[model samples]
Structures are given as C-alpha cells and as structure tokens.
Target chain A: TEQIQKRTAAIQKRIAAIQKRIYAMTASAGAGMSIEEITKQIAAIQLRIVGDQVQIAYQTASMSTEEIQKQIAAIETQICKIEAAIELKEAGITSDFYFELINKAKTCEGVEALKEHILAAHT
Target chain B: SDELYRQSLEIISRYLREQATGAKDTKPMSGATSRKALETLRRVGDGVQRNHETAFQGMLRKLDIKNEDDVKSLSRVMIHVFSDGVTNWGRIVTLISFGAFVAKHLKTINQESCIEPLAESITDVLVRTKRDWLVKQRGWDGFVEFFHVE
Candidate 1:
C-alpha cells in the first residue's frame, strides 16, 4: 500500500512540476518577444512531460489494468486542466497568436482554404 | 459552424443512446427469431466486452506495465468508484460520463494531428483524480487510519 502511495505521489509530483514549467514557458512565449526563445521553452516542456511519462510507465509496471487505467486517466485530466489554465493566462494578448495559429493549423483542415474563407469574409 | 458542431454532437449522442438502450433490456421470442435475437445480443455483448478488455490491456502494454505486482498496486491505489461497489449501474454511469467527456475535449488537442499532448493530458488527469481519492479515503496522515483503532 505504501508502495502504491509513494508511486502515485511521485507521479503527481512530476506532473505538477511539468505543468508549472509548461505554464511558465508558455507564458513567456506569449509575451511575443522572440519566436526562438518561445520555441526553446516549449520544446523543453515537452521533453520534461515525455520523460515523466516514461518514468510513470516504469513505476506502474506491477499495477493492475484498472489501476493503470486510473493512473493514466488522472494524468490526462491534469493536462487538460493545465492547458486550460495556460490558455486563460494568455488571453487578450497578441503574443498568443502564434500558439493559436499553430493550434488552428494543426486541428483545422485546409489552412489555405481557411485563409481564403477569412479573406472572403473580409471582402 | 454551430450547426455543424451540433450535428456532430447529435450523431455521437444518438450512437451512445442506442448502445445504452440495447444494453438495458432483453426478451424471449419464438424459435428461430428467439435464437437469432439471442445470438445477436450475445455477439454484441461479446464485442463490447472484448473491446473494453482490449483497450485496458493495450494501454498497459503500451506503458510497459507487465508485472502482476505493479498491476495490483496501480489498481488498488489509483482507481476509484463513486458508487458503494462495482455494480452494473455504476459502470454504465461511469462509462457514459467518460464518453461524454471525451467527446467534448478530445478534439482540442488534435489540432496538429498530434495526439501526444491529449494523451499526456488525459493520463495526468486520471493520475491526479486517483491520488486525490486515495488521500481523501486514507487521510493526510496516511493508511494507518484504515487499520488503527481507538
């Protein structure tokens, strides 16, 4: 039981740390000073999150299906929460356009089509 | 745009509702009809069960969590049910809630077709919820409360 507790705690700690780093980096990036600086910070945050994920997998090697599922689920919930928080913080700033652009470009289909649509709307 | 999103939601909701209803009721019928209906239900049930098991197993395998000890530890520590126990109703409600939640937020992280962020986020949330539940049930002092007497 203690082992389980310890492992869960470790995972949470890593996730929280990762979220903090992501927020800080994303916030800095949103300041719109330099693309290189922002990209570097975001990259580092991604690396940290990936590293924690691997560690969690190793730590949970002995866990049951239900246990592992729950653990993974919790991680997912926190990431969404953190992403929402970051988005909230960057609201009302032009610096966030890059992130927004990236998100739109990634999720939306036919970027050129969308651009044309926007242009048409304006016209 | 709003209509498009609404249509998507409607389609998904209808699909889920059909699944729920189908799982809820069973009946007897005449000879061939009865046998065919029974077989159909059986096939549906088997597919659902297999899919659920496969998803969980795949997740564990993907994570490389192979040992029984680790599996037991994760299950005991992380998973929580709001219900008093694992009843059919409890499971249905949980599944429905999970499905709706996914439908709402899943598209957010798919922006770049990179599901890694979404995957990572989902894992963090699950882990956090489990941790919080454990802390609440066992108390801040630790698991001693579960065994100690006055």
Candidate 2:
C-alpha cells in the first residue's frame, strides 16, 4: 500500500508537470509562437533589415532605393505590431500563470507544502 | 514556529547547493515559467544584496532587533517594502529570498535564534498584505508550477 501510494504520488507529479506545459503551449499557441521563438525571429529580421539599410546606403540596386525603403518600412511596421502582440500575450500569460499556480496549491498536502514551494523556488 | 522555520531553513540550504543538470534527454523540457521564475529568483537574490545593501543596513538599524521582541517590527518593514513595490510573482520571490538574506545576516551576528522570529515576521507580512492575491493564485500551487523542473 505504501508503494502504491508512492507510485500514485509520482504519477500525480508527472501529470501536474504535463498540465503546466500544456498551459504554456496553449498560451503561446494563441500568440502564434512562444515569446522566445518570436524573439529569435525578430532578431533575424532585424539583422536582415540592418543589411538592407547598409545596402540602401551603398549604391547597389536590384530594386530602386525607394522600393527598398518602402519594404523596410513595412517590415518595421510588422515588427512593431508583433512587439505589441508580445506585450498583450505576456500580460495574459502572467495572470494565467499566477492563477494556475494557486489552483495547483489548493491540492497541495498542507500549509508546509506551500511553504516548501516558496522556499524551494527561492533558495 | 521555530520548528517549521528551522526545517524550512534546512530545506533552503539544501536547495541552494543542489545542481540541476539536464544532462540527458530523458525528461520534458522546462517551460517558460520555470526558466523565468528561476532567473527572477536568482537575479533578485543577487540584486537585493548587491544593489540594496545600504538600504538593508539602514532597515536593520531602524529595526534594531536586539532580541526576539524587536523582531516583530520586521513585519511592518516588510509590509512597507511590499506595498511600495509592484505586486507580482517576481516580487513575491524577492520577498522570500531577501528574508533569507536577512536570516544569513542574523547568523553572521551570532543571533541565529532570531532567524525563526524573522521567518515568522516575514510570514506575517505575506499573510497580512498578500492574502487575497495568494488565494487567487491558488495559494502555493501557482508557485509550484512556476518553479517546476525535471
């Protein structure tokens, strides 16, 4: 019976872990990608945008300089919108994450379990 | 209170020393909350001591906790500190870690017995000020999620 209870506890912990990832995935999926992934993409786009600016500065043109400038402006606009999207998503994620943890705490064994939660995360 | 505080300190010390190596592809990757929460905790623990050292000393002087009786004032100080800042998970973590920092100080001064009273005061501050938010966050379940690792 002790072994059974121990196994049950292990399974419960695993399930809780899976549930948290699900929450994160769902939160990010709503925003198209995880913030970290979106951030990486943003960096790549910025790099290309910088190169395009350098190209615009020097006289090299497959497209006209004006055309390149227009495209750059559009890309910058898109980046701004995505940044806004990230801010919105992050706000929702923060509230959601906090409530989720509280919900999980309700099922904790005792007050000391909650104490351990804080102490464990912190120290 | 002393027993719980002593055990809690023991747990904290163990936590400080444990190494979390993801050396094998055996477990699921930690989520964003886990990564960010740990980062926030580590950053705040260092930032408080490094950046706020003078303020910390000033607060200690104001408290002038010569005995356990004076430790009660720490609750008020903490309540002021928490109220002065934005309330968030990061701030909550900072509260706990900063308390630990103070506990370490108490040990440094040979007032190790006062650490338990200090712990009680910190608990009082949280319960007094953040009870609603803590309840909404689902008590400590929410924290468990934020800090969960493989």
- For TM-score, the strongest prediction is 2
CAPRI band of model 1?
Answer: incorrect
lDDT of 1 by residue, B83-125 (tens): 1222121132223333322322333333222223332332333
TM-score of each: 0.21, 0.35
lDDT of 1 at A64: 50
Query: Which segments of model 2 are wrong by more than 4 Å?
Result: A1-123, B1-44, B65-70, B82-86, B144-150
| Candidate 2 CAPRI grade | incorrect
For model 1 the local lDDT of residue B38 reads 31
Q: What do the candidate models score in CA lDDT, each in turn?
A: 0.35, 0.43
